[PDB]
Write a protein that binds this ligand. Structure first.
Ligand SMILES: Clc1cccc(Cl)c1-c1ccccc1
Ligand SMILES: Clc1cccc(Cl)c1-c1ccccc1
Ligand SMILES: Clc1cccc(Cl)c1-c1ccccc1
Ligand code: FES
Ligand code: FES
Ligand code: FES
Ligand SMILES: [Fe+2]
Ligand SMILES: [Fe+2]
Ligand SMILES: [Fe+2]
Lengths: 433, 180, 433, 180, 180, 433
């Protein structure tokens, strides 16, 4: 048993200290499924994954399989992919179009809303069907992205997102046409804890600007150029959300990393011309000079991560303390030129799939970290999250909210600090913004 | 991606033998990390491709594979393959330094002629066994659909196109740091 | 901790509700091994598996490997397959004939009764061998079948079986010559809880009359006939044992199911002619119209299941909460014509092997169910076992015991009720019938 | 089931090639779920057999395989294979709806003449890689002993008999929903 | 151990077929536990070698394999293989009594001639699947580098030298109670 | 919970009884990592494995990855192969030479002593580097062999070894030249508890004098000789250390088994001639007649095992209650003839690697034992450790320390007794010699 006291002591944001047991302990894992995944807003995909009536995506909330499905009234319904009779999976494929769903075990039939409409031999054997359909999640959409939450007490999505939204709009709100998902969702398995993946995208430009991605960068520069010429960006900022453990980081004015990653046509599109002007115009209300932002990472706590200029998105599905699945897709402006959509597609494949020249080095690190945490002494001393400690300020002229340097772990400490709060505060009365 | 449309009349024994041998030589290059020598086999118009694969009800079976407009595991040109070869031979390419230990077992080779003389459409099956670090093992199976052209090199052929159909939906490996 | 109070709360036969944690909880599993498998009568096989002196079969009682061996005095002994010196497996092959057993590790030698008869270097290094043989189980036969129980305080097998016996005798007591096992014991692994399997065969005709086995039936009907023409059986009954969690269900009068599964020759044998009338005569003391019973499923709690018309028998070997091994064989009447025996063999392979047109679809269901149970929300709400609630009664003119309709869960509720009883009552004083 | 009794003089290069190509074609049909096209290969008198295999002491090695009057994993005729093809192509056939993704890697093809013209006894090795749903992987290895007759079809042969010797006692898979 | 130095001009069809058929026959002996017949294939001067393989950075790539003066998984002469054959065929050899079930799937055969007539340097790839007892499965991949001599025996050739390069650092099996 | 009293009950050296749960219990295992491996002296290898400045070996202490590295001043350091920033492996290959170490995740660079010497962007984001390097182990040497211990309160190596040292010298101190390790370390995985393995090499000549290795001997005798004529020694002794759970056993005079294992050249080298005479000279003061000792096994508790005359050395790395890794290497006298060195290499490969004609049969036995212990009844009765009870003596006329017969379990009882003590006594005030 884990006391709330014992839990509060796992993360110290004032000293910048993290207890390594957070990444490996089985008991904390099972508590996370209740206290974190059981009541957070989790990303399921984009509206365009399910555009027409009956279109469905089978996905996860924690280790709970769920079905995301468009309704006739254009609403999106999300219910548990589990029959309340004997637990069978109702929707048994990845995606498609359904007129209804039928349990393959005993024939209990559901409408596309997840409502139990038929039970074979009901008169001869029975009970209200309106109470025996699968558990529904709350569904909210933020500019295309579809989110779900089990907990009726949890704040609404917008309140939950708070002052993180400006940095989501950088990617999501550049045109009145909105975003669309390029077809296809890549899925793969990494034997590490979800928090390493979530933290890296929340807070860790450090690893991309140091050693992890030297070879990724090398793959992306011209053949004639070598690493000794590689343009190091050191200008940038980091955002920690007012509430919720969200965080983002980005480079400023230095297109070195974006150009290597996304090529010249995407970099020019993101920074110069009609689309880039309109985006800055559309985002003027936040005051941000979005065209000076060249390469950004972000996490919406716990497990929604994305790279704005590059438009790669990922959902981390936890599979115990020692495993995750990565489900990845990419977005483009719905009204982007064919040539640009094609650039985003090819470079997202080249850099960020399981074969990606960036992704490869990420998983290699995470895998060894987790293996180390099997050791007793490897868990006996805190890890260092002291970088940038006491250096952030809520009054930056360019960027809103709690802002520090690009190489910092203020967003990180915020993430672990909020993880700790969700783990130690049973009741939303205290937990809410 | 239906059954390979093999020609009625089988390839000649010599042609059959030559293409199997090409593949065996290619496997030896890859399994011995002769990345420079392997890249030399890629023609300038190479399209190297590995589509995503999904679970679908039979009635929706046509949606199994991703198309040219969707994401993929690989979707490469000579240029981008070059970058990958630069990374995999790089001291700071962590995913393959230390390198992995791989075996490309090649079988089921079916050779088909094309409208271009000395250009061949080739189907084959594989198991790629990848062992890495202390105890990591990833096993892949699938087929490859190549377009090969006769070439004056040490292998006899160049690769104009490769499609790899992997027997997987969710990849069970943490990465694809290997070549297919 | 799992207190009796808490254990009592996992099953509710009154309201017909099941806590799905019973299928997934590791702690409950460890208790099951002690409280259920440690003290139930478990099927080890048939007498004809070990026909001659020294003939043995290596099998399991839960996760304890045991040896069942024919003795010199024609009795059968079952002992733990584990040397009390340092734990080595004494009998290392699946089956065969032995004159003796010798431990491969330090040469401790055993007769075919499990008795320790030789310790190498005993005089030089030593203790009474008579106290150091492997643990022996109680062994009881019921009409050809060999059951074992570790617990000297448990009821005897006849009492344990109680009013389940008439329904066993439909399969086992049809001829004066008895039954014999077809050679061959199939074994395969399913990643699901043992209770899903035991309940299906206890109580779940419903799944075979709805969706699970539609393609199974399709595979067995004439090439010219399609699914629509397959007559739908809806006539039949279900039995719940007075004590012990045993249950059975069968079709009456409608032979369509049996015809597709076993074909006309076996269907004929079971229902028409001399052998069929001899069966009804031998069982007249029950008053059951056995020739009208056409397709039956039964579980003798916990893990002994069979299908009396088709003579398929299974033992479920638990392997943690998330896995079982299935070990399967088939029985024929010993004096049945050779032609009928061949038919029984063929259709058991075709239908109930790991590649079986029926079996295939069961494992597919179970696999996805257990997978769902990894989720937090998936274990948070009860499962519905309300079918036939209140509708069973003890006075049926044709079939004795607590009897209701074929599509019901009275047998299921009884099973989980008894499971609950063994899990929460340490003493046989309160537990016995 | 002893060692395959291979002929001292090995089959000619063309026959060897014809039979290997037949298997390669068969694997393409199976790995692309062309179940009716594959079933057309089965002769009306097909015996399709996969015996049980057990752990025996050397002294009792003759009892390793199940016999003709015993249970087995498969023991099928043309009529029963048809029921299975009807099931595997069925919308209500859950075990293969959604369908698995399989790879039949075929090698070690040893060809032997029989007393009958155009009828061959063939030994080969295989690995069957089956990937199912999100993360299920079942690997099978074994040998096949076939009797094949020449035939005027797209494959050049038809199957008269097939026995599969699987390297497994207890099946590690939840089912055998695939064809060998 | 660099890439196999295959000859520019490939071995002829007949020679290619003979050596492949040799391996398929050798694999059948092994997989059906014909240990005495297998051992007869080994020449008086056999060297049978399976080096250790370690994780090294690219700069230390030349130290990947153990050497002649180091430990190995196997490093055998005719006399030591003889003792291994007596153990594996022995009633009290517990590791293989009950025997395992193995499959040696052979492919990727490249044939290279030597200075000595009727003596060939041969490269090939394998997957060895080992199933044992109730539930144990050990899968091995690698390549073999053999020196074969034409021999007047049942198989066609005798084994003068064998080096096995296993794609493993730490062995994932509890033993190597099989032959490669 | 595992209280002291409960832990004391698991082992009874007076009666010779072992509770089989010690090998299977997950909770006990995790305590082991803390109370045994966390404060024991663990073998990392031989000095010659890291002979020159910057030579390293990546190894383990329990499940903690460590780096063993030669320093300029010739001392050897051992640190946790884990970066304190976010846990990444610092040294990512098995062995080699290093000038420094750099973390691949964020570029924290370390010198060859494991001192943190450079943090990228330290000036602009930060804390004292001297306090943030990997945890350091105490390192001690005994006649070539390198041990490490985390616990600063533990006794020093010499005191820890006590009167085991003379039995070690039989292998390690035969020449003023010392020993050298042959190149290469074999590594393989066995699914069994480490205690089976440690005990076997501590106390178990019995298994080699009975049944385990009948086929090993058969592989090493002349082809003309058959098993019935093989010379099975029955003469020898067993040592139990005065403190620490160390033990050894050996054959006396009868060279039969040594000849079968090591051949005639090694047997003669060990027993007769100048080298054997020098060894007798060097060691005689310890009271030991080394030339009569013909085949010996030893364990230094917990996981350092070796076979003095065969010079096979092994390290058992725990991987949970149900698995180990075996890391094997072999030693030779540095000045031994080239021929004898070669013979040591050949015969160690032949006998003692994962394909060894001896090693094959040990793994085979252990795999089955551990599998058995999944059973409930398998863990319910004590195992027999009564061999040689009250037959050992401390004033033996030929051998020093506490000495009994070769076929005894006194050295095993001592091992499990010390294990019990390490697991129940948390202070070195009570535990120390
Ligand atoms: Cl790896 C990288 C390259 C270029 C731009 C960015 Cl934001 C990144 C990046 C930085 C931290 C986490 C994920 C991705
Ligand atoms: Cl699947 C089936 C077909 C025909 C007749 C029966 Cl009793 C069954 C059957 C019903 C419940 C459990 C197992 C099998
Ligand atoms: Cl197996 C053997 C043969 C000859 C001499 C000895 Cl000490 C042994 C031996 C005894 C116990 C453990 C390991 C090895
Ligand atoms: S599980 Fe869905 S109907 Fe029974
Ligand atoms: S374990 Fe059976 S005699 Fe030692
Ligand atoms: S983990 Fe080593 S530098 Fe970040
Ligand atoms: Fe990264
Ligand atoms: Fe069923
Ligand atoms: Fe041993």
């Amino acid at each position: 048993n884990w006391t709330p006291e014992a839990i509060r002591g796992l993360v110290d944001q004032e000293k910048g200290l993290l207890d390594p047991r957070i990444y490996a302990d089985q008991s904390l894992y099972e508590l996370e499924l209740e206290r974190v995944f059981g009541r957070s807003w989790l990303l399921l995909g984009h509206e365009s994954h399910v555009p027409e009536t009956g279109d469905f995506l089978a996905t996860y909330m924690g280790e709970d399989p769920v079905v995301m499905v468009r309704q006739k009234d254009k609403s999106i319904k999300v219910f548990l992919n589990q029959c309340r009779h004997r637990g069978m999976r109702i929707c048994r494929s990845d995606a498609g179009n359904a007129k209804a769903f039928t349990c393959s075990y005993h024939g209990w039939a559901y409408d596309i809303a997840g409502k139990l409409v038929n039970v074979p031999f009901e008169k001869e054997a029975f009970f209200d069907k309106a109470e025996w359909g699968p558990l529904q999640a709350r569904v909210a959409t933020y500019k295309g992205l579809v989110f779900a939450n089990w907990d009726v007490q949890a704040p609404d999505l917008e309140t939950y997102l708070g002052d993180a939204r400006p940095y989501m709009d950088v990617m999501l709100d550049r045109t009145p046409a909105g975003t669309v998902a390029i077809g296809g969702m890549q899925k793969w398995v990494i034997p590490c804890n979800w928090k390493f993946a979530a933290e890296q995208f929340c807070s860790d430009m450090y690893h991309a600007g140091t050693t992890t991605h030297l070879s990724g960068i090398l793959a992306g520069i011209p053949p004639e150029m070598d690493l000794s010429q590689a343009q190091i960006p050191t200008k940038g900022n980091q955002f920690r959300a007012a509430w919720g453990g969200h965080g983002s980081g980005w480079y400023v004015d230095e297109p070195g990393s974006l150009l290597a990653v996304m090529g010249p046509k995407v970099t020019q599109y993101w920074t110069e011309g009609p689309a880039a002007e309109l985006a800055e115009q559309r985002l003027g209300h936040t005051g941000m000079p979005v065209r000076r932002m060249v390469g950004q990472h972000m996490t919406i706590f716990p497990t929604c991560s994305f790279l704005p200029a590059m438009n790669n998105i990922r959902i981390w599905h936890p599979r115990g303390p020692n495993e995750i699945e990565v489900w990845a897709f990419t977005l483009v402006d719905a009204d982007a030129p064919a040539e640009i959509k094609e650039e985003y597609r090819r470079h997202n494949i080249r850099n960020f799939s399981a074969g990606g020249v960036f992704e490869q080095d990420d998983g290699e690190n995470w895998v060894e970290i987790q293996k180390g945490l099997r050791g007793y002494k490897a868990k006996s001393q805190p890890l260092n999250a002291q970088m940038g400690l006491g250096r952030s300020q809520t009054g930056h002229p360019d960027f809103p909210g709690n802002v520090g340097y690009v190489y910092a772990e203020e967003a990180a400490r915020g993430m672990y600090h909020h993880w700790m709060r969700m783990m130690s505060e049973p009741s939303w009365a205290t937990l809410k913004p | 991606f239906k059954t390979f449309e093999w020609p009625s009349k089988a390839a000649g024994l010599e042609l059959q033998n030559e293409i199997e041998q090409f593949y065996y030589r290619e496997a030896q290059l890859l399994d011995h990390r002769a990345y420079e020598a392997w890249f030399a086999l890629l023609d300038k118009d190479i399209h190297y491709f590995m589509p995503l694969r999904t679970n679908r009800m039979i009635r929706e079976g046509e949606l199994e594979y991703s198309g040219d407009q969707d994401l993929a595991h690989f979707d490469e040109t000579h240029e981008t393959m070059y970058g990958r070869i630069r990374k995999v031979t790089s001291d700071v390419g962590w995913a393959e330094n230390p390198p992995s230990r791989t075996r490309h077992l090649v079988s089921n080779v079916i050779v088909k002629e094309t409208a271009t003389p000395d250009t061949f459409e080739v189907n084959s099956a594989f198991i790629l066994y990848r062992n890495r670090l202390e105890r990591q093992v990833d096993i892949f199976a699938g087929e490859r659909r190549d377009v090969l052209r006769r070439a004056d090199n040490n292998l006899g052929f160049s690769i104009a196109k490769r499609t790899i159909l992997l027997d997987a939906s969710t990849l069970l490996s943490n990465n694809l740091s290997m070549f297919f």
